[PDB]
Short mmCIF file of C-alpha atoms (C1' of nucleotides) in Angstrom, two decimals:
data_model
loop_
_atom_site.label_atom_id
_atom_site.label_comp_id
_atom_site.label_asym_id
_atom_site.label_seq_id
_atom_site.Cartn_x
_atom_site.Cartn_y
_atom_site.Cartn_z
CA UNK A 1112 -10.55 -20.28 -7.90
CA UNK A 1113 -11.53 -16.98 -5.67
CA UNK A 1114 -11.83 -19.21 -2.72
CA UNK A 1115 -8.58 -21.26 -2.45
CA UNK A 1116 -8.50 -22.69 0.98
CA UNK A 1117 -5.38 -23.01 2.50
CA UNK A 1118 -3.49 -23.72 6.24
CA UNK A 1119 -3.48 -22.36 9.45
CA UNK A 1120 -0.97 -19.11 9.62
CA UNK A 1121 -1.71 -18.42 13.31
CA UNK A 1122 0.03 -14.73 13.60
CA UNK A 1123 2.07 -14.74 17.09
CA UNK A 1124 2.10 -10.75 17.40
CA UNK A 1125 4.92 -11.22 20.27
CA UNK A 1126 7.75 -13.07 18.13
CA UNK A 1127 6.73 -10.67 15.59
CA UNK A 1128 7.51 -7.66 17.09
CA UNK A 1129 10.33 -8.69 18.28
CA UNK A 1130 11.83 -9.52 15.14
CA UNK A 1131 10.35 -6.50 13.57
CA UNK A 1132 11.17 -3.96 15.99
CA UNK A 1133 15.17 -3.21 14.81
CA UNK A 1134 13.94 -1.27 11.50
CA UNK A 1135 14.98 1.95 11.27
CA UNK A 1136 12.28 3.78 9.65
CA UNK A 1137 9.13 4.97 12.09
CA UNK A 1138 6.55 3.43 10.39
CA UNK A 1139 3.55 5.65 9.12
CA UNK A 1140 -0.34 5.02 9.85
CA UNK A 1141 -0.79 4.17 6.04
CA UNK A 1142 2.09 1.59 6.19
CA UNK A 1143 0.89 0.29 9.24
CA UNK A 1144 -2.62 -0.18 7.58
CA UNK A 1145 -0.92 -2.00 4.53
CA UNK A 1146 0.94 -4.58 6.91
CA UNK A 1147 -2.36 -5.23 8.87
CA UNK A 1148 -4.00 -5.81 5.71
CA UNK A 1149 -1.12 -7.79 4.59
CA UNK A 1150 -1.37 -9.94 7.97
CA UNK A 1151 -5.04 -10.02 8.02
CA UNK A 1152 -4.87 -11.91 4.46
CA UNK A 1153 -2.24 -13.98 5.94
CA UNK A 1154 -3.76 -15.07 8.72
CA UNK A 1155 -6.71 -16.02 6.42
CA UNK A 1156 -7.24 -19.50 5.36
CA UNK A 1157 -8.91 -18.01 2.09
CA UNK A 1158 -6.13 -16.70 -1.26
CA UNK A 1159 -3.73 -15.01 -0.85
CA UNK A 1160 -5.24 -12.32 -2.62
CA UNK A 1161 -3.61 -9.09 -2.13
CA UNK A 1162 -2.86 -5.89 -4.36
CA UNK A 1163 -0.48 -3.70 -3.19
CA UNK A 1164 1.78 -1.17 -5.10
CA UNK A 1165 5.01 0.18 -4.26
CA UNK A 1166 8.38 1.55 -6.33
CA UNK A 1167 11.57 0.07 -6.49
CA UNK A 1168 12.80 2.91 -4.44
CA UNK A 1169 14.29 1.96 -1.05
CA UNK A 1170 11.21 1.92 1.73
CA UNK A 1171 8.83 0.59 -0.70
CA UNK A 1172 10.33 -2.85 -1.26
CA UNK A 1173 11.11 -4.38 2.10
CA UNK A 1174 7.63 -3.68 3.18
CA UNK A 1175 6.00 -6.89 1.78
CA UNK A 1176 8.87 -8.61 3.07
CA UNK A 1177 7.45 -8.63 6.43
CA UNK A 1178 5.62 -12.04 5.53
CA UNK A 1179 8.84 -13.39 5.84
CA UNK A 1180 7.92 -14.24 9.67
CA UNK A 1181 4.52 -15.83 8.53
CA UNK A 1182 6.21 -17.53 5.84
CA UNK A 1183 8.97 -19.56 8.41
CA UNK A 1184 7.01 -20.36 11.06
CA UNK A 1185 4.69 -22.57 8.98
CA UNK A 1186 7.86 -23.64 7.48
CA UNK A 1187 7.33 -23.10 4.13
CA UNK A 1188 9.54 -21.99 0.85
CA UNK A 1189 9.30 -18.71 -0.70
CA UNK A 1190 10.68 -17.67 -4.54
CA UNK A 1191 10.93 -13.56 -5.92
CA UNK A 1192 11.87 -13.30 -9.30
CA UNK A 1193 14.59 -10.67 -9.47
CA UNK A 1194 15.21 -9.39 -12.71
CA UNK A 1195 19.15 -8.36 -12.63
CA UNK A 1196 22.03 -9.85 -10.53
CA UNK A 1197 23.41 -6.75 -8.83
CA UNK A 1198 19.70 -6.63 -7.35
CA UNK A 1199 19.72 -9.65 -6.38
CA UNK A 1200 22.86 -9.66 -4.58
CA UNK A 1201 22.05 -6.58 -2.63
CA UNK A 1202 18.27 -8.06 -1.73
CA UNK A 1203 20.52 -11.03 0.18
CA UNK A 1204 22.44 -9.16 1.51
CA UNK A 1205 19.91 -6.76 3.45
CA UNK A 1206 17.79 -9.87 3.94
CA UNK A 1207 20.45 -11.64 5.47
CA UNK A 1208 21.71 -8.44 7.69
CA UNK A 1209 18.15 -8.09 8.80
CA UNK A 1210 17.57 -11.62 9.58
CA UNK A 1211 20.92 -12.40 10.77
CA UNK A 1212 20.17 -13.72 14.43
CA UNK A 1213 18.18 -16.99 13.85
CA UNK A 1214 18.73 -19.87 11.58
CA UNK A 1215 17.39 -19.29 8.41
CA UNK A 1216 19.15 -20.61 5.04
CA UNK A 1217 18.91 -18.51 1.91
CA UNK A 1218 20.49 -19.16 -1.22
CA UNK A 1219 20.02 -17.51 -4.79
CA UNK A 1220 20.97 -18.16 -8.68
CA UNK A 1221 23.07 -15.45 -10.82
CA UNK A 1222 25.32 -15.41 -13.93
CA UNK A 1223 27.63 -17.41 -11.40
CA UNK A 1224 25.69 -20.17 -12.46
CA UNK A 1225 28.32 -22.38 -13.38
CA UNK A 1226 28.37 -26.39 -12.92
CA UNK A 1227 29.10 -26.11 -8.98
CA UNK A 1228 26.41 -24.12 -8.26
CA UNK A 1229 24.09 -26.28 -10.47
CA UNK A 1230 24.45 -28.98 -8.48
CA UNK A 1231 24.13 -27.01 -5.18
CA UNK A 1232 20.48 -25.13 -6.29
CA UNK A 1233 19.78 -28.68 -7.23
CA UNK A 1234 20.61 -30.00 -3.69
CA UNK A 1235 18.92 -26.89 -2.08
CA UNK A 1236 15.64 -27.53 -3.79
CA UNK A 1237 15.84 -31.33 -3.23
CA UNK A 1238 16.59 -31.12 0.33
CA UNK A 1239 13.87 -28.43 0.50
CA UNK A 1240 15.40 -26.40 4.15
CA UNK A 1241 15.95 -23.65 2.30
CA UNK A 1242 13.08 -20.64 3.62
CA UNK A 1243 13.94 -18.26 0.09
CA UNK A 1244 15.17 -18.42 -3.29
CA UNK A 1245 15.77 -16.08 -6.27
CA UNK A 1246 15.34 -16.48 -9.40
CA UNK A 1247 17.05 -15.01 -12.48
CA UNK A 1248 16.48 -15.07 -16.21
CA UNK A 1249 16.07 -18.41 -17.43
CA UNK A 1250 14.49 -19.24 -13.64
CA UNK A 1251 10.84 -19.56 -15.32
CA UNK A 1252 12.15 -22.36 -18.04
CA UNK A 1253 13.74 -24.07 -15.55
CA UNK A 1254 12.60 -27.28 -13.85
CA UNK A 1255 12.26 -25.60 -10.26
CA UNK A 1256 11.74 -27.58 -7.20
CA UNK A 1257 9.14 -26.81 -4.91
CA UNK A 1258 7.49 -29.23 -1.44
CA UNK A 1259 5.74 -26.50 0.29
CA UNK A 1260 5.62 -23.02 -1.78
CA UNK A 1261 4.13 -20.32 0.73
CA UNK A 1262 4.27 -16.91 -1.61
CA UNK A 1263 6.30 -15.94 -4.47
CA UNK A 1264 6.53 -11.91 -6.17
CA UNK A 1265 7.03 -11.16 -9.35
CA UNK A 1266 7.40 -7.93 -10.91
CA UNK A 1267 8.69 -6.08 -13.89
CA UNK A 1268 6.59 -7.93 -17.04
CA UNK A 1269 7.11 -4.80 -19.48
CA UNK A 1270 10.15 -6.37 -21.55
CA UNK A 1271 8.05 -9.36 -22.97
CA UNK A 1272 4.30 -10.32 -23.17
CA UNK A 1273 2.10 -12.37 -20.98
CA UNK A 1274 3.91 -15.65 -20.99
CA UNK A 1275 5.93 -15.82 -17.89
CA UNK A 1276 2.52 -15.54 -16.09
CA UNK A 1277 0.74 -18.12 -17.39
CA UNK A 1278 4.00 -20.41 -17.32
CA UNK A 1279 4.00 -19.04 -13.56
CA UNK A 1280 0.11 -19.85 -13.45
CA UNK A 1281 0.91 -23.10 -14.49
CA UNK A 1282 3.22 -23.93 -10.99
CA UNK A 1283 0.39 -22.98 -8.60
CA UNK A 1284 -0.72 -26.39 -7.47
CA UNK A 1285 -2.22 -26.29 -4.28
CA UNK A 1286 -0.50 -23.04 -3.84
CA UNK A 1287 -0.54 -19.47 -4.09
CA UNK A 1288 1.35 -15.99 -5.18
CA UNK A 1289 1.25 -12.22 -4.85
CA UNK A 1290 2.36 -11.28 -8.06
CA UNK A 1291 2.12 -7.79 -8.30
CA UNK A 1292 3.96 -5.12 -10.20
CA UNK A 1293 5.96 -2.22 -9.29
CA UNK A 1294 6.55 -0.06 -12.18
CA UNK A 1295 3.14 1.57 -13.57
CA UNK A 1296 0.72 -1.28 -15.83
CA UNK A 1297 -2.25 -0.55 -18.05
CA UNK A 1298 -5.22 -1.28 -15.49
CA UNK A 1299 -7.27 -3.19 -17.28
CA UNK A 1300 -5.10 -6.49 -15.74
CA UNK A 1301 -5.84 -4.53 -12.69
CA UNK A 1302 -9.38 -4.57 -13.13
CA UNK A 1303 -9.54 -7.90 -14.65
CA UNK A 1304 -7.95 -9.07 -11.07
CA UNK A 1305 -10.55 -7.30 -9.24
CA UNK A 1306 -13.46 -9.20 -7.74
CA UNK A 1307 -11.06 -11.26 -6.47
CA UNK A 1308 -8.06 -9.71 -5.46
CA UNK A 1309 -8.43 -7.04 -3.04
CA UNK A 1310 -7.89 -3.55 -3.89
CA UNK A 1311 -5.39 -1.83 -1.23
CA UNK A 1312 -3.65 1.51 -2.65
CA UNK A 1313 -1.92 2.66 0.47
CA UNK A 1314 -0.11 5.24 -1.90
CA UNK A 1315 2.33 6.51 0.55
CA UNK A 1316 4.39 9.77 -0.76
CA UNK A 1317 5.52 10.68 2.92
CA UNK A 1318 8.19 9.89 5.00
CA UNK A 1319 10.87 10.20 2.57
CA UNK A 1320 9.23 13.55 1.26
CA UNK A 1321 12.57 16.02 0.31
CA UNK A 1322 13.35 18.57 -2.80
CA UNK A 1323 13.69 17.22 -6.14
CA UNK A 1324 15.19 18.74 -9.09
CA UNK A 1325 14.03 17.38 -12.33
CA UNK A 1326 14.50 19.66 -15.56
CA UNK A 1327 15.53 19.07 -19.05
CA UNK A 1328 18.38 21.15 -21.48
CA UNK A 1329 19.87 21.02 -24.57
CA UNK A 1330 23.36 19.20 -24.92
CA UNK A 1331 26.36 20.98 -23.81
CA UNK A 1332 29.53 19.83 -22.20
CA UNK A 1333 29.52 22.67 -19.68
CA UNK A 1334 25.95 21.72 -18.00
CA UNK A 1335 27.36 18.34 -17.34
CA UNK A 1336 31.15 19.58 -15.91
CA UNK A 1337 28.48 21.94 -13.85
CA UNK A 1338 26.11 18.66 -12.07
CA UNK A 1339 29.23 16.71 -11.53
CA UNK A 1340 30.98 19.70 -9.27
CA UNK A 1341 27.71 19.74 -7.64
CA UNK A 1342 27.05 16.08 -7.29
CA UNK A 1343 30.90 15.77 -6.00
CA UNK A 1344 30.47 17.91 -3.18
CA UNK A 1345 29.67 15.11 -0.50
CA UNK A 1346 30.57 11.94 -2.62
CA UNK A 1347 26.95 11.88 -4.42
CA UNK A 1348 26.49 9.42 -7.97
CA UNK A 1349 25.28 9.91 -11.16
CA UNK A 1350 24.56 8.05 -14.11
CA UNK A 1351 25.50 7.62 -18.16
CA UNK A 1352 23.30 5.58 -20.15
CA UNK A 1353 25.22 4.37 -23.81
CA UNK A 1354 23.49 1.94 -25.89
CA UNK A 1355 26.27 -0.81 -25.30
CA UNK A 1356 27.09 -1.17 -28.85
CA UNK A 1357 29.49 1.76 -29.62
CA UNK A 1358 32.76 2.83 -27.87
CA UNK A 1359 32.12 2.35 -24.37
CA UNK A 1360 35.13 3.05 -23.11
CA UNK A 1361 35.60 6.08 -25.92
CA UNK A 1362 32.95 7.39 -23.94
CA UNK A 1363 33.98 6.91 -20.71
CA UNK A 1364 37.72 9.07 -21.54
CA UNK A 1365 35.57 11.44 -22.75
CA UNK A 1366 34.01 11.84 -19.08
CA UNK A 1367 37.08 11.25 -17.54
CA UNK A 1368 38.58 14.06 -19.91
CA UNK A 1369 35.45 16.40 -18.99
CA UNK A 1370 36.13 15.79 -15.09
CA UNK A 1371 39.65 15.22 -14.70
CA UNK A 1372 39.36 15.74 -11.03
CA UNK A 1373 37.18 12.69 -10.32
CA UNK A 1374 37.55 8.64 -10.93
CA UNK A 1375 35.34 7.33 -13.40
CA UNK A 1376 35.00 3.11 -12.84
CA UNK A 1377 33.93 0.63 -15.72
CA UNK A 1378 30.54 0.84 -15.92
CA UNK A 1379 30.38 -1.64 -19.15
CA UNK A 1380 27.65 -3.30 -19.34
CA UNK A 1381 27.10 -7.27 -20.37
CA UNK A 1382 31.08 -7.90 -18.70
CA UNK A 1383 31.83 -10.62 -16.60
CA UNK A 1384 29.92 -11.60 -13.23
CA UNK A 1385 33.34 -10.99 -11.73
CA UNK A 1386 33.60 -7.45 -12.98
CA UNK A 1387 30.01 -6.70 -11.79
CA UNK A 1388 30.64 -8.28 -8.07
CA UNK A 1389 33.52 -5.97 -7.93
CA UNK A 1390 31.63 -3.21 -9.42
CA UNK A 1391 29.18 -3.36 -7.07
CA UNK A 1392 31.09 -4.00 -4.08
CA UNK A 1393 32.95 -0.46 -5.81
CA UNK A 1394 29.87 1.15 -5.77
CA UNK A 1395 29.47 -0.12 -1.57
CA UNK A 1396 32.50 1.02 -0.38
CA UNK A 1397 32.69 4.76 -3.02
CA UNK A 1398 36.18 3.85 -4.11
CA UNK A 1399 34.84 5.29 -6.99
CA UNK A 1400 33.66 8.80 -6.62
CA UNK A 1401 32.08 8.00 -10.23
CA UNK A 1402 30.18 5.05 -12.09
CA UNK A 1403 27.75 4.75 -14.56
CA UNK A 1404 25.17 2.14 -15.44
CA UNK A 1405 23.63 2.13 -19.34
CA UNK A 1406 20.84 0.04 -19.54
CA UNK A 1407 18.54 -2.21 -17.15
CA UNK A 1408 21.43 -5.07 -17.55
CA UNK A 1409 22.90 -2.70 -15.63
CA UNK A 1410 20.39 -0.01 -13.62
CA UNK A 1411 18.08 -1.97 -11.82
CA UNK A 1412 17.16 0.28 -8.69
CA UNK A 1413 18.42 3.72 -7.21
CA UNK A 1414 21.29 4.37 -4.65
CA UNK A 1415 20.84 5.90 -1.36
CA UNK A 1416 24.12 7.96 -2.13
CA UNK A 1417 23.05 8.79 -5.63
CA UNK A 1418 21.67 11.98 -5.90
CA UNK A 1419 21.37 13.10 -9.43
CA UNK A 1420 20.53 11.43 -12.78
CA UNK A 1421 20.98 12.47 -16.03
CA UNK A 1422 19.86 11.15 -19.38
CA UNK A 1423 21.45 11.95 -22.72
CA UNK A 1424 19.82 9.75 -25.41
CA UNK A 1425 16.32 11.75 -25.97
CA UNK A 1426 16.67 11.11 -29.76
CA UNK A 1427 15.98 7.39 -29.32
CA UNK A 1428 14.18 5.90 -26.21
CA UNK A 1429 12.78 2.39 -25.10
CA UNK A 1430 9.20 1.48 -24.55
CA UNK A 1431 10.76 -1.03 -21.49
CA UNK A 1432 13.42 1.53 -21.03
CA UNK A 1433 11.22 4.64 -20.04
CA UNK A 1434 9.20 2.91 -17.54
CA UNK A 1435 12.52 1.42 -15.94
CA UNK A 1436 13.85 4.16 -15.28
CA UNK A 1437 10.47 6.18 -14.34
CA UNK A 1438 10.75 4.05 -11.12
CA UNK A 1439 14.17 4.67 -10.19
CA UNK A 1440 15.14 7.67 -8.93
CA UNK A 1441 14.82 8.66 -4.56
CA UNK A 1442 17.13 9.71 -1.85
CA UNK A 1443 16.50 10.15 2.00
CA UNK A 1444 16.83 13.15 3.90
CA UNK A 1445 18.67 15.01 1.32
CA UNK A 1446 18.34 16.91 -1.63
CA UNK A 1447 17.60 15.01 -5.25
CA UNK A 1448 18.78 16.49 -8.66
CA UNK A 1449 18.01 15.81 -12.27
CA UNK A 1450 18.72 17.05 -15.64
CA UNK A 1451 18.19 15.60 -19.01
CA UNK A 1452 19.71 16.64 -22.53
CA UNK A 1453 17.46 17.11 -25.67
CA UNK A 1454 19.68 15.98 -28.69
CA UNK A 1455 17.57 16.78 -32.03
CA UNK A 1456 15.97 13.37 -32.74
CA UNK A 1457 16.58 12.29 -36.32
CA UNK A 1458 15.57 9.18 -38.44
CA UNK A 1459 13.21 9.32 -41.36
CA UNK A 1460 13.49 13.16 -41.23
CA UNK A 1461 9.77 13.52 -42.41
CA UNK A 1462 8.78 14.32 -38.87
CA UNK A 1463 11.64 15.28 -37.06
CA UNK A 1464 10.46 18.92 -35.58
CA UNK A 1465 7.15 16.82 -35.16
CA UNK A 1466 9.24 14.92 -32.67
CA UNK A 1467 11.18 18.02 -30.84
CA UNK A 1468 7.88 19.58 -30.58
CA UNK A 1469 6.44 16.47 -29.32
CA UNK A 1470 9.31 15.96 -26.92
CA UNK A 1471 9.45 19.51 -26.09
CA UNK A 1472 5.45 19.22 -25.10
CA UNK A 1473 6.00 15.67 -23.25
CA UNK A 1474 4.57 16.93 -19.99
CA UNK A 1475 5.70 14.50 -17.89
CA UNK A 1476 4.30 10.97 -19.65
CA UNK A 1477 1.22 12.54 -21.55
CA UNK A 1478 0.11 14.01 -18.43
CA UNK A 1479 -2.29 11.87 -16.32
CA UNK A 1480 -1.82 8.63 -17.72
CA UNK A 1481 -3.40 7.29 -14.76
CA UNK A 1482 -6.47 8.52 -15.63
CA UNK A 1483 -6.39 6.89 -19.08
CA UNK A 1484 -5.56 3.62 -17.38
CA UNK A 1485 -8.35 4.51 -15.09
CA UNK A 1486 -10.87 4.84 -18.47
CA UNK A 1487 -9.30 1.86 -19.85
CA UNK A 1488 -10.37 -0.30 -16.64
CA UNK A 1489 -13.73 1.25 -16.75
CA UNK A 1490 -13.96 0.27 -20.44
CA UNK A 1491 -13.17 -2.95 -19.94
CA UNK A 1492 -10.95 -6.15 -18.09
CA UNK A 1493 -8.16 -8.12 -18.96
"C1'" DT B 1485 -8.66 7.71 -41.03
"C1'" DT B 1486 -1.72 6.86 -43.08
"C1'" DT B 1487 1.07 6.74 -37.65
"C1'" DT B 1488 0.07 9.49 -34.46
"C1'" DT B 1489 -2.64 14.43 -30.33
"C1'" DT B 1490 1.25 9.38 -27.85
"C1'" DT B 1491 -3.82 9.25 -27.14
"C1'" DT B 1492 -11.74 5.83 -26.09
"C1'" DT B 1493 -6.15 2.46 -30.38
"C1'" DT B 1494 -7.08 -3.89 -32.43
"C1'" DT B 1495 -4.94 -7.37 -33.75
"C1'" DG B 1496 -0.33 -4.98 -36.72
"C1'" DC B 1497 3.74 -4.04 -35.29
"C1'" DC B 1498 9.63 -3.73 -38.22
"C1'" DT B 1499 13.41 -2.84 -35.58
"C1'" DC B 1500 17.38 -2.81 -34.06
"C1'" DG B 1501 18.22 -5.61 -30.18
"C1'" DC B 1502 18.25 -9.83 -25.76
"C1'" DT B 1503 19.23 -14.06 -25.37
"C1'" DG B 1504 19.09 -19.81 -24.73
"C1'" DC B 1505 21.49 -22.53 -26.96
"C1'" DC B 1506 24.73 -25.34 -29.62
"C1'" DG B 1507 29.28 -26.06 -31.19
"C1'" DT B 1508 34.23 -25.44 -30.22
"C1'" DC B 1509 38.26 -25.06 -27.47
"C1'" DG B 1510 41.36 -25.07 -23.20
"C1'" DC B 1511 41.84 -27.70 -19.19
"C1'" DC B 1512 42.03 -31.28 -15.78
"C1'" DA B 1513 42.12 -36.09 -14.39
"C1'" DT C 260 43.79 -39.35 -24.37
"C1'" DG C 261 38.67 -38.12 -22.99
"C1'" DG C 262 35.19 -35.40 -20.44
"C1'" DC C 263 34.05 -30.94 -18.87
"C1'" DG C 264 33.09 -25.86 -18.30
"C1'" DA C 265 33.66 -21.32 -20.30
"C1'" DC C 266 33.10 -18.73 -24.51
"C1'" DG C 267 31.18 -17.05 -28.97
"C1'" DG C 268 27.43 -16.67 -32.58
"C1'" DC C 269 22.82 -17.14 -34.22
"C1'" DA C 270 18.18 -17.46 -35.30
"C1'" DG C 271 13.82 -17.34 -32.15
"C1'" DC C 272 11.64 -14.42 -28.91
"C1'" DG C 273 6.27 -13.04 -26.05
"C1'" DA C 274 3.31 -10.64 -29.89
"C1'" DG C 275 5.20 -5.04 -28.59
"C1'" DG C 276 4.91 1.56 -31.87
"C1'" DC C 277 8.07 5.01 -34.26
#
DNA sequence: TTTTTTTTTTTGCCTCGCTGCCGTCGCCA
DNA sequence: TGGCGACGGCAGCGAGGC
């Protein structure tokens, strides 16, 4: 229940600091509040009990990730359910650059998941060395190993109902998890978890505060040539969203017709793990001074490089879709652009200008939505 | 109180769309 | 010649507004 008694996690400030000193971002009072917090609960023999909220821009995701020194001194096996592969890959990759100089093992499942590497997540989890995994799609129907689970995250429930939690709930014997999530939730699960999970909204804006440019036109050719001469001025990113059905690559001559001057990659989307790998090591190394990602197969976080972002398909939009991408978008120490184009939305036709008016009038997600989650938690929990 | 003021709106939601999976085929021993 | 891994299609998929 509340209680749930666990081990000793004795904290070793020294070691920590050590290993914790190479980040390169000053930390801020409020973030150091949220990893005291996050240390304090640790350190704890009580749950593991924590709420805290952060986006899946850069600075807000590697902050939990701390633990990871509490979590391999007691020797124990960590799991983060990472919705995409290109994610994924790039979480192991920082993990394993910042956690290069001591022996720690870290392996991962992705569409790679052919017969070879079957048999290796198979000997991973029964030899049981391995500090973290992560998971993929078909990771919570999957007979997963576990001897000593220490945390686990999970994020991103918005494309299907509550199952995966309760099939997650399910796995928690004699063990714990932090499951929290990063894009915006109604808060009644938030105040259904209260009373036992402690409430710590660190809400930290600052430290990557810069100009952002976020407005909204009608379609025209021109305003897009315009953003990518600006975006191409130092190498920047943008991105093209298609609905993965039509002419993909009609619409990626078009682009390459409208900017000539610049190379346009394959952004298709559901292609080959190869073709991804390559596309992403493309997207490391700006080969290409342009490439595009569609849908969340595909955009899954926010580049450092990337400065501008552009959607074109207001006429039809995505429950899952629009809170993706609402938690996407951040650059450091530079200046951030956005535009959007407003193509007349038609369907039924009986309310079509009830729509552009509507869209028109969006104010930014009705407004404060938080307060109406805030009502809604009032109202009632769970 | 029609589907929306996209919201103090309950169990209704239709809608094109994501996908685990099963069968089939090329390949290697 | 047989077993295997990659590939393609399809009906199920939590229970979800335009």
């Amino acid at each position: 229940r509340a209680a749930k008694e666990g081990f000793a996690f004795k904290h070793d400030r020294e070691q920590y600091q050590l290993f914790c000193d190479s980040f390169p971002f000053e930390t801020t009072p409020d973030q150091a509040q949220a990893i005291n917090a996050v240390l304090s609960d640790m350190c704890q023999p009580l749950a593991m009990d924590r709420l805290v909220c952060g986006d899946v821009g850069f600075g807000k995701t590697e902050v939990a990730m701390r633990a990871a020194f509490l979590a391999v001194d007691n020797h124990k096996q960590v799991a983060v359910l990472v919705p995409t592969t290109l994610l994924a890959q790039q979480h192991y990759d920082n993990f394993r650059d910042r956690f290069a100089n001591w022996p720690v093992r870290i392996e991962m499942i992705s569409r790679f998941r052919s017969a070879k590497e079957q048999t290796q997540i198979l000997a991973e989890v029964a030899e049981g060395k391995i500090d973290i995994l992560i998971g993929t799609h078909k990771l919570l129907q999957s007979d997963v190993k576990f001897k000593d689970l220490g945390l686990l995250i999970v994020d991103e429930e918005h494309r299907f109902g509550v199952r995966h939690k309760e099939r997650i709930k399910a796995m928690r014997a004699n063990v714990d998890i932090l499951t929290l999530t990063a894009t915006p939730i109604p808060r009644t699960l938030n105040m259904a978890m209260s009373g036992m999970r402690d409430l710590s909204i660190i809400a930290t804006p600052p430290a990557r505060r810069l100009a952002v440019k976020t407005f909204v036109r009608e379609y025209d050719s021109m305003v897009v040539r315009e953003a990518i001469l600006r975006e191409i001025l130092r190498g920047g990113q943008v991105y093209y969203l298609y609905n993965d059905v039509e002419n993909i690559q009609k619409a990626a001559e078009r682009l390459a017709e409208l900017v000539p001057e610049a190379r346009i990659a394959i952004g298709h989307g559901q292609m080959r793990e190869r073709e991804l790998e390559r596309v992403m090591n493309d997207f490391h190394h700006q080969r290409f001074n342009v490439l595009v990602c569609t849908t969340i197969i595909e955009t899954g976080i926010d580049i450092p490089t990337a400065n501008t972002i552009i959607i074109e398909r207001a006429d039809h939009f995505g429950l899952a879709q629009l809170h993706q991408l609402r938690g996407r978008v951040g650059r450091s120490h530079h200046q951030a652009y956005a535009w959007l184009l407003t193509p007349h939305p038609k369907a039924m036709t009986t309310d079509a200008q009830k729509r552009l008016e509507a869209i028109a009038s969006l104010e930014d997600l009705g407004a404060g939505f938080a307060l109406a989650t805030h009502d809604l938690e009032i109202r009632g929990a769970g």
